[PDB]
Symmetry: D2
Subunit: 210 residues, 4 copies
């Protein structure tokens, strides 16, 4: 087979709720591991209709589906080191927004982020990496410079500031995103994941998530 991926998507409130609920089962050590059976997997072959895009860090400890106790076909996932944006990232999120009509973008940071740490070391010490790793650090550095100017001092302040700045760039660069937000068909949420206890902590959002 049936095609179930046509027709309208859900709303930002229902989409956020399901992610909230899922991270709660994960936190409590009670994951249901849903939407992953052999039969569910086989029915996904004709198309996808995820209810969210997670734009997360590539960090191996921040596996988005696991941490929000989702399965297959639930979330479109874009992941780069320190969730930095280039034109392929931006096109990836726009595909989900404009073709899959996802009602929710989650920008997902976390503590002990090596991309945020590298940008701190660059600014404090002039320690810069080489090759394309420098391109990642380049894109994080402004978050740290803007935080510094606002009197931020703690790593966790910079990590949170980086999520907010990522939200801000998505908004400024993409009329696809900002026009759907204005229209009320899309919300964007800034979240930090806590490696200690596995809580996904809402910090920021544009649009109604309930």
């Amino acid at each position: 087979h049936h095609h179930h991926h046509h027709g309208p998507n859900t709303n930002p409130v229902a989409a956020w709720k399901a992610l909230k609920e899922g991270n709660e089962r994960f936190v409590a050590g009670r994951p249901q591991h849903p939407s992953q059976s052999v039969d569910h997997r086989a029915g996904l072959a004709a198309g996808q209709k995820p209810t969210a895009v997670i734009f997360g860090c590539a960090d191996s400890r921040v596996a988005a589906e696991i941490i929000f106790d989702q399965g297959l076909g639930d979330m479109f996932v874009v992941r780069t080191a320190g969730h930095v944006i280039d034109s392929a990232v931006l096109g990836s999120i726009e595909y989900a927004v404009t073709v899959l009509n996802v009602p929710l973008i989650v920008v997902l940071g976390h503590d002990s982020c090596g991309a945020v740490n590298a940008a701190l070391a660059a600014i404090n010490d002039g320690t810069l990496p080489g090759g394309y790793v420098r391109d990642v650090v380049e894109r994080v550095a402004p978050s740290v410079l803007l935080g510094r100017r606002d009197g931020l001092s703690r790593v966790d302040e910079f990590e949170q500031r980086h999520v907010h700045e990522t939200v801000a760039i998505l908004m400024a660069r993409s009329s696809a995103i900002s026009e759907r937000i204005a229209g009320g068909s899309l919300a964007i949420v800034g979240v930090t994941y806590q490696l200690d206890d596995g809580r996904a902590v809402l910090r920021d959002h544009i649009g109604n998530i309930g």
Copy 2:
């Protein structure tokens, strides 16, 4: 002792992925490395044994389909696993800072991005916004495929995996030097949405498949 780095070779890293995918295929996943206790030990740092560079598609959830847990794979995902400078820096971060022994390029069937590039080339149907930037980067795979006489969409998906492998090697001396040194391998895989098999298509560097 406390060791730094994954302390594993490409053969073993690949073996664990193959075995995890068999568990998933069989509908017998372990859901390993995601208990509250194991999770708590990860706040200390990450030692993943591979970087997965996969499609953003909600049905190709890399950790689930290889039946891995937290701390196991650094994950980079864009639509059609297209590359640009943040993508490349992210993969290079895992290769050079985390010293991962394996890069897995994960394509799959029913890829929207490959489909969009085929429509671009067949009809001159092009998306707008930054989604076009994704399609632009897939289009060469289709053109080179067409030139070699491929016609089937599964063939283009497979060709695109191969072209992505080749781009990583061409643009990143960090990657190509470690492959030459024997400390790194790269594997191209197609995931079958039907049955969940991650199918081996391509590799450079010894992964124990000889």
Copy 3:
């Protein structure tokens, strides 16, 4: 200054060039000495890197007249976009000129890729990939001549700048900025107006 006077100066400059009577203005030792103070150009030229399409020469301008961005086949990436926005927002140039030309090796290479599957390696592929949708779009509309894709590519470049840059699109809406799309002819040296958004007189 203003978009109308900016484009007038450029068109007249190109006429001096076409006639083989260049002034070579604004390049004296003394004028140059005064530029060390600051720059206040009247236009940004986004042109091709081609050695034969030297923008200051073909518009018969001098030093401090035009901010110049040049990539193979006037393809855009973020550094390009950022450069144009610098002239637009920091220098307040009233005019953007998208400068294409005939016998463009990038449009040609994009032609060869779409017709043959002939593609370059390295970063040249990244240039061609960016020109390819111009060729695909023009082909969908029954374009067949090489000079025609060249023009279509100038139009697409104009459209991309408008769509990607609210700094540009807002100023064009407010009337302080105009974007002009032009094709340079290698043979007679004429810079030919093909496209524009905003009032250019």
Copy 4:
């Protein structure tokens, strides 16, 4: 029209021509060569430039003028602060590999707004918006590395930025780095002085003479 085929010039002769060129410019005796009606008609055949200049977009740093060249002499890539993105890299590689240019000039200059803006970001946390931030982000590492090495004066950061741009091109492009090892290409770091119009050699990889 004709279309000519053949080997391009060598790194020593290409640098000599520009060196001599800028001397005419400095001296206020511009010959404005390779711009005649007839010469222009000749170039319809094909371009055969002897150099790629990768320069700043700054309207005061007009490359053909300051080096007193004409049409068909130099392939020209310009971005604000001569920052590199993949279109820039692809542009330079087209010149290097297809046009076989024996010389790449990375052209910085004094009073560079891109370098200025990067200094203001690291010192004050002053960051521009939109895509201008992408330019400043790419210069910022040259300033951080400068500061670490004890540089203070603005001119020293401008020069350190030219050096970092040369190093990125060498590191990102195997097409470039192989040709420099083969001896068929050279890369030069130059700083243009707005004051006297002088283009000053700073660093170089390959033999320029």
